[PDB]
Amino acid sequence: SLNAKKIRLENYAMKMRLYPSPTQAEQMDKMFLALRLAYNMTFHEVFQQNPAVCGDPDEDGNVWPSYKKMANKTWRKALIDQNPAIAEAPAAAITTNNGLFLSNGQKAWKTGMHNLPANKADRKDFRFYSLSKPRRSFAVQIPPDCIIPSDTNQKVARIKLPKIDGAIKARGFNRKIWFGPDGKHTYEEALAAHELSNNLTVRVSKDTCGDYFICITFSQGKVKGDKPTWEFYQEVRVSPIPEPIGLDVGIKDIAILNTGTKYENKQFKRDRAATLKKMSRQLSRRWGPANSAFRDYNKNIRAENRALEKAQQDPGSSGVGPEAPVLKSVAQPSRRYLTIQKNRAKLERKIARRRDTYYHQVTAEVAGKSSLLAVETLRVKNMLQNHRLAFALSDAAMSDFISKLKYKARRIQVPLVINAAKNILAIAQNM
DNA sequence: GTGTTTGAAAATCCCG
DNA sequence: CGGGATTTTCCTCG
RNA sequence: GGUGGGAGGUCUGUCCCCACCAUGGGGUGCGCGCACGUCCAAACGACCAUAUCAUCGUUGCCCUGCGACCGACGCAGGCAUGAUAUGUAACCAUGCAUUGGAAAGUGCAUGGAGCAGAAGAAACACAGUAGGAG
């Protein structure tokens, strides 16, 4: 009767929220800045055909950036020689297989630039790290002993991060996953019995709003024979008697089930669209960015600053005191702009969070009841041909819905492929 | 939106 | 001053 | 009684707290009152204070007056609207410094955080939010 079922998992990522002291948050911010500086400097040196960053030339002269020269200690030593602020980040966040270069840079150069040599690709198309896409993440390796769940509370744990002392407090410890040969151990029981990986990857991320999250990735090592190197389970709830379900997507409903139940697509954007438009037109007039009277002002004053520096340097010879080059500042957004910016970010975060949780609820309720799903297509680009759904689908981001259905129908191993829904289910059964 | 991934073991550095 | 904490090193990239 | 929100990992209601609207109208039943259920009325990312400004009749009115034309115009004014900045916000307990004879705040270190029902795979990369430079 709707009993929870423990099933084996190949990968997992506990998403908790850190509650660090201001010093701890400052240190992690410095670590993020160090990572972004490393990325930017390395991927500016990649375009110069530097042998220390770029690999061995081919017989034609084609040179690719070999990342082994980026994970070696010599490159990091040279980097920390060039600037000291890069040393404020752990070398594991850079030199490891889940670090800055071997994981992020490799994917960036294999997807964004389509895997092309630095002598045949431009700089404008490559995406750096800046205010538009800041590096709010670092991945390090910590043993399980650095994760000590609090005994009193079922959802509180203390996390110690490298270069930070204080054992940052964490909330959101999912106790619905069990470790061990058959998932009969808690976290402490598995750690004390030596059934956890001696090195575990954790990602510390800072979202758009001021907040911190941690992702403790649990991954089985090898797949030799049939026994995983590290075994962890998770209890999920399934309907006592599952029945085949044909899924049809309508206009006013996010999903229609052949059984009869319905879920009305809340579509939280429009219900909050007035507030979003009000805030947008608000900060469009404030003294922060996205105003066209602050962007232009900052860009201009930067231009005259550069021109004055040039005129002071070469024409004046920079002897002792030539003229007086004014520096001042490069402008900063005001507090009244900042509060509305933070509130706006909080509000899209709330909308996205509401949509994510609603889609999780719908997918969990439908996956357990269904033994064989009958969705039309895996891609939303194949359902906009009629264009009728476009108005609703503009806010109804069904990419997340499709992904959630995909990885919630596979853990129970449910295969994936009202009158219309019944016809679709019948066709799927026939095929 | 669409696609792809997810450590383990030594060599070296440093505070009660 | 020596065990533990941090740094490195592994492998494949046109 | 409603609306919006701040912290308790996420969603709904409740718990604690912050800022606002209502104490209205109507269509019908019963004996001016009670109203079975509603529909409209608001309140939508704070509120107060401080300066510095709307501008093509604006930013509405008072026209506070003045002047000329034949209801309309200009000049010198005032409030209220709106809109940009400075100080100021949102659960509980302890310690320190500082304001306070107190009552109670300020800043720091922290420490703790539900209740009922659902769930909880995260990150990165690329057409974009358009920029950042090395």
C-alpha distance from residue A367 to each of A106, A208, A220, A263, A376 (Å) = 36, 31, 25, 14, 16
- One-letter amino acid at A176 equals K
Chain B, protein-covered positions (CB within 7 A): 1-4, 6-9
Cβ atoms within 10 Å of A7's Cβ, excluding its own: 14
Burial status of residue A355 (CB atoms within 10 A of its CB: 0-12, 13-18, 19 or more): buried
Q: Which helix (H) or strand (E) holds A365?
A: helix A335-369
Contacts of A130 (CB under 8 A, 6+ apart): none
Q: How far apart, in whole angstroms, are the C-alpha atoms of residue A337 and residue A265?
A: 33
Residue closest to B2 C1′ by Cα: A379
Q: How far apart, in whole angstroms, are the C-alpha atoms of residue A361 and residue A373?
A: 17
Contacts of A234 (CB under 8 A, 6+ apart): A6, A7, A9, A12, A176, A177, A178, A411
Contact between the CB of A219 and strand B at under 7 Å = yes
Q: Is A67 helix (H, G, I), strand (E, B) or coil?
A: coil
- Between CA A326 and C1' B4 the distance (Å) reads 49
Strand C within 7 Å of which CB atoms in A 116-155?
A: 141
- One-letter amino acid at A374 equals A
- Between CA A275 and C1' D55 the distance (Å) reads 28
The domain ranges of chain A are 1-237, 247-274+337-430, 295-332
- Between CA A427 and C1' D46 the distance (Å) reads 56
- Between CA A37 and C1' D31 the distance (Å) reads 82
Contact between the CB of A153 and strand B at under 7 Å = no
Secondary structure, 3-state, A159-202: ECCCCCCCCEEEECCCCCCCECCCCCECHHHHHHCCCCCCCEEE
Contacts of A220 (CB under 8 A, 6+ apart): A10, A11, A228, A229, A230, A231, A232
- Between CA A277 and C1' D55 the distance (Å) reads 25
C-alpha distance from residue A212 to each of A24, A74, A203, A331, A342 (Å) = 11, 32, 10, 27, 15
Instruction: Give the resolution value in Å.
Output: 3.0
* Helices A398-409/A335-369 angle, 10° precision: 40
Q: What share of chain A is helix, strand, coil (3-state, %, to 5)?
A: 40, 15, 45
Strand C within 7 Å of which CB atoms in A 78-107?
A: 90-92, 95-97, 102, 106
Cβ atoms within 10 Å of A262's Cβ, excluding its own: 13
Q: Is the dihedral of CA A92, A94, A95, A96 positive or negative?
A: positive
Residue from A373, A120, A386, A143 nearest A259 by CA: A373
Contact between the CB of A162 and strand C at under 7 Å = yes
- Between CA A349 and C1' D126 the distance (Å) reads 23
Residue from A172, A164, A179 nearest A219 by CA: A179
- Between CA A335 and C1' D79 the distance (Å) reads 30
Chain C, protein-covered positions (CB within 7 A): 5-14
- Between CA A46 and C1' D9 the distance (Å) reads 40
Contact between the CB of A377 and strand B at under 7 Å = no
In the complex, which nucleotide's C1' lies nearest to the CA atom of residue A410?
Answer: D121
